[PDB]
Design a protein around this motif. Sequence first.
Motif, PDB file in Angstrom:
ATOM      1  N   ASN A   1       0.758  -1.220   0.000  1.00 32.39           N
ATOM      2  CA  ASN A   1       0.000   0.000   0.000  1.00 32.39           C
ATOM      3  C   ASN A   1       0.839   1.351   0.000  1.00 32.39           C
ATOM      4  OD1 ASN A   1      -1.692  -2.001   2.298  1.00 32.39           O
ATOM      5  ND2 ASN A   1      -2.779  -1.181   0.498  1.00 32.39           N
ATOM      6  N   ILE A   2       1.996   1.251  -0.693  1.00 31.23           N
ATOM      7  CA  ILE A   2       2.932   2.435  -0.732  1.00 31.23           C
ATOM      8  C   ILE A   2       2.854   3.265  -1.961  1.00 31.23           C
ATOM      9  CG2 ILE A   2       4.530   1.191   0.801  1.00 31.23           C
ATOM     10  CD1 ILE A   2       6.385   0.856  -1.648  1.00 31.23           C
ATOM     11  N   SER A   3       1.981   2.934  -2.929  1.00 30.70           N
ATOM     12  CA  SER A   3       2.024   3.570  -4.223  1.00 30.70           C
ATOM     13  C   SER A   3       1.608   4.997  -4.299  1.00 30.70           C
ATOM     14  CB  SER A   3       1.215   2.821  -5.304  1.00 30.70           C
ATOM     15  OG  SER A   3       1.628   1.429  -5.413  1.00 30.70           O
ATOM     16  N   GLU A   4       0.895   5.460  -3.247  1.00 35.45           N
ATOM     17  CA  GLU A   4       0.444   6.796  -3.200  1.00 35.45           C
ATOM     18  C   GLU A   4       1.339   7.794  -2.493  1.00 35.45           C
ATOM     19  OE1 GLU A   4      -2.105   4.652  -4.955  1.00 35.45           O
ATOM     20  OE2 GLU A   4      -2.327   6.896  -4.957  1.00 35.45           O
ATOM     21  N   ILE A   5       2.452   7.294  -1.941  1.00 30.44           N
ATOM     22  CA  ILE A   5       3.515   8.178  -1.476  1.00 30.44           C
ATOM     23  C   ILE A   5       3.920   9.128  -2.626  1.00 30.44           C
ATOM     24  CG2 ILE A   5       5.959   8.267  -0.813  1.00 30.44           C
ATOM     25  CD1 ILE A   5       5.441   5.607   0.682  1.00 30.44           C
TER      26      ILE A   5
END
Length: 331
Positions: free
Chosen positions: A55-59
């Motif tokens: 769930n890191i893609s929106e950094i």
Amino acid sequence: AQNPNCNIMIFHPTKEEFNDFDKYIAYMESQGAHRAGLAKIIPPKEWKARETYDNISEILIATPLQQVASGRAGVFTQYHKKKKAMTVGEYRHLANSKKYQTPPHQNFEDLERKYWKNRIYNSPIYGADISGSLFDENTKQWNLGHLGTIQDLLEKECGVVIEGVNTPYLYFGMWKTTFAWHTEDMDLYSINYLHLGEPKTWYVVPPEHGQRLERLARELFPGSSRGCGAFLRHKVALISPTVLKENGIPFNRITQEAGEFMVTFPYGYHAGFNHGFNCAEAINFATPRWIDYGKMASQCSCGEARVTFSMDAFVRILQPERYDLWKRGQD
Ligand SMILES: O=C(O)CNC(=O)C(=O)O
Ligand SMILES: [Mg+2]
Ligand code: NI
Ligand SMILES: [Zn+2]
């Protein structure tokens, strides 16, 4: 004397040994690890930095940097061209595109050969120096957002209370992204955890031999050297292993893989490159043994190096004679 050839050491702490960070650094140094400038720490099998990376893609990478090289394949500088913001999911897709993806290769040594042959002919994009952390707040061991602060260490050792804070930084890399030859600000330690993705290859000069690297660098980058008496603080110069070997500079190399920590020690010059899309987290730290290194650290006062708020106090307290000139460089 332990580790007299200054080899990079690799450590495998148990879960019990992984509880007390300061104690384990001091252990590694008892075995001579600092003499290399760099050590690898493989966490116990029970440990994890966080549950998943799903769930890191929106950094946001607010200012991706295109690393443009000049010079020759083994001796070059890079400058950082600012690009438009993009998310981590956008950057991962970019890293995996035909233009930027890792080439086919046999093994890490073949990839290293290809890096040194070809790096200068490409301009990879690095998401560097992003304040933040990917450690779960519940990870109690070796959580790079929960370390003792350098300000608190200086206060414990020297009694002087100072302003400043100490937080981690994220690095999102791709094939050929490059970290130039440097020591840390104020010759601090660093610790770097590779959270995910492809490896990172490191090169390091033993601290006791750092001035040999500096003298080579002044010879290889003679205009830069005239411009500034500490131009490696600009973090732009690259020298290949072949060139270092040709000039008799002592160094070592190692490849870090996902799930591994690296520690750089005071005044250990290091450089390296990423193999493909990855994410690392790193922070500076101090121990009692750092204080003498901090007091002797070179400084850039030409204006190029421009650094954090918190380095002010370190200069002001450890290097009061240099403070006025250095601060002029900052302003
Ligand atoms: O990973 C990188 O790009 C650079 N990192 C470091 O220099 C470090 O952790 O000290
Ligand atoms: Mg996200
Ligand atoms: Ni570093
Ligand atoms: Zn400078």
